């Protein structure tokens, strides 16, 4: 009998997560990792937050069971999630229009949404930005959903091409999903203004789209509440929406797989009925979600003192990234770049969408041991005072 | 615009995990939880193992990052998993024929395996025993695979009907998946003997089946090595197989979501090609797996002294369950059951597949606050010296 695996086609390594192994294997002295979006401190450590360590110490001392969570996870984690997303005292919360499942990361939340929609609704098409995080298409395609692209970035002026965005969504139909990044658009770092979010919310209602927000960076653009303004503008008028949120970056809990899928419907009866099918989709995937990271988040968000410690740590990360963004632009100039990189200062979040080409990114790896994503996305949150001059010399060398 | 969620049909609660909510809500102080397969201690707590607490205390004091694991998880976890499954020094390991991905539980490993097969092979169907764990059908169907049943249990005589099993599997075609429970068949507790496993392995090779092992209870039948004899009989002569294993029960790590998907192929080239697509399927599901529980497992298994503490705790659980199984049969007779319940002694694992009908299980809940699964499956590992008399009085009253 011919093996079942004989006809398999190899898949390439992931263009983002595969960079870790490539970086590790490189033997060039002075290599620099700017790939996966993870926060580094000034010393080059990707740290555990102090608030997280304190929560983990509390759990070690107080947990007396590991019994399965419910399919939707820890109830306090869901309550705190809805407050972060919508605001305490939101009508969505008071009217019991939203239900939240704790999931294994924001990716898990996107997947649970995809499987839920594919099995239980008439959704067949999801619109994502050009460019976007590459795993969006993979997640929705896994469920058999068609993924189209809408225009988003003006690569010439390094701004949002809002007129092309509007034009390109003209053919998005009622009952199609349109996916928006809540803040810190990945990879461009360019987000709608509040006025643009309000225009998009109105258009979405008029055209009957189902909005899906990917919210992986709440707190990294301007602050927790400011970064939710776009989502909240959508929440103010829509009957239905979905939010896939992540605590990987804003709590530094990447490998503990901490996210949430929040389903909003017109009323409590409808959301509860829909959520019962979301739970069935979870049960048939990974059964129930991992407790450790979500329990850390719930422990921090439900305790005023620990929460204040965490929100200061998040503000401190944002401040350091902003300082690196400015130092990067200045050092590129110092080291002889003639391209104007001032547009990088306007980008929000952890990255610089640099305009470097695929060929330049590959040269930076092969000739200089500097690792970025082939889309030109560079992790500013991985830069330090000690690595800045060599990384900028390398970039100037490939321009 | 009519809402996308307006016409969704509600899903029922899960027949196993839904018992957690029903039990927790019941106000009667005498309620007894015999539902989900979790181990209780004599004080009535579902505990954290001492080895696990020790490992968690080490992780708390020594972890310096939460950076993403690889898509396939912690390397030492995969090594230790292959050794448990196949034996240190197995030819499968020496010949580099096996690749392991850490997953969010055994369920996550089943779904990853099913998505991998549906999307990269000609597999269309999985053969599952009658009866089996109810979530098997849901996992496989959610990945797009048809599920067919093969004969297994003789419910009137409470035994494995091996001739009926082999006869029904003649309908399985080359390139179909056949699911086997590695040990502690859920729900019946009846496993093939070693000779029967060897017979099944030879037939599977001759017929071209792709074996998938669900191995959630290694250590709960007879012991770690003995419980893997059936899997190892398959590993001796198969070109290809898949193992979905779980550490939820044998480490008591239920809510940390700790399992593995292991692929075996004819040679290193083939298994590495296949595994590249398994990684792609993971990436598009939950991205990468949760570190905390798997870190605990790797810490325990890779330290000789801590491993010995854990293996004694696992033996102590298995022995207490055996004592409860023997006490349950006697107590049923003292409480007035006339019928033969000796078949319960022959069952391996956490459960007793009791022969109670759906109506009897519902009466147990409603009238006595005793919670079992509607199939008649009862969690012997939830029995204690203190709850045995009331649970047996309730059972006799509904017979
Ligand atoms: C970080 C990221 C994610 C996924 O996050 P996880 O929590 O690691 O699964 C999802 N979407 C975007 C846009 C991201 O940047
Ligand atoms: C325990 C169980 C599972 C699920 O295990 P998790 O690790 O919690 O996902 C899978 N299969 C069987 C047969 C089980 O009993």
Residue numbers in the entry:
A (entry chain A), B (entry chain B): -2 to 396
Quote the paper.
E. coli aspartate aminotransferase (AAT) is a pyridoxal phosphate (PLP)-dependent enzyme that catalyses the reversible transamination of l-aspartate with α-ketoglutarate, yielding oxaloacetate and l-glutamate. During its catalytic cycle, AAT undergoes hinge movement to switch between an open conformation, in the ligand-free form, and a closed conformation upon association with substrates or inhibitors. Using our approach, we enrich the less populated but catalytically active closed conformation in order to increase catalytic efficiency (kcat/KM) with the non-native substrate l-phenylalanine, leading to altered substrate selectivity. Steady-state kinetics reveal kcat/KM increases of up to 100-fold towards this aromatic amino acid, resulting in a selectivity switch of up to 1900-fold, and structural analyses by room-temperature X-ray crystallography and multitemperature nuclear magnetic resonance (NMR) spectroscopy confirm that the conformational landscape is remodeled to favor the target state.
We collected X-ray diffraction data at room temperature (278 K) for all variants with the exception of AIFS, which could only be measured at cryogenic temperature (100 K) because we could only obtain small crystals that were not robust to radiation damage at non-cryogenic temperatures. All six enzymes yielded crystals under similar conditions, which could only be obtained in the presence of maleate, an inhibitor that stabilizes the closed conformation when bound by both WT25 and HEX14. In the inhibitor-bound state, all structures were closed as expected due to electrostatic interactions between maleate and the side chains of Arg280 and Arg374. Overlay of AAT structures (Chain A) in the presence and absence of maleate show transition from open to closed states upon inhibitor binding for WT, VFCS, and AIFS, but not for HEX, VFIT, and VFIY, which already adopt the closed conformation in the absence of bound inhibitor. Interestingly, the amplitude of the open/closed conformational transition that occurs in open variants upon maleate binding correlated with their computed ΔE values (VFCS < WT < AIFS), suggesting that this metric can be used to fine-tune this enzyme conformational landscape. Furthermore, DynDom analyses of all variants confirmed that only WT, VFCS, and AIFS undergo hinge motion upon maleate binding, which rotates the moving domain relative to the fixed domain by 4.6, 2.6, and 5.9 degrees, respectively. OpenLow mutants had lower KM values and were more catalytically efficient than WT with both l-phenylalanine and l-aspartate, which could be due to the fact that these mutants have ΔE values similar to the WT but stabilize both the open and closed conformations by >10 kcal mol‒1.
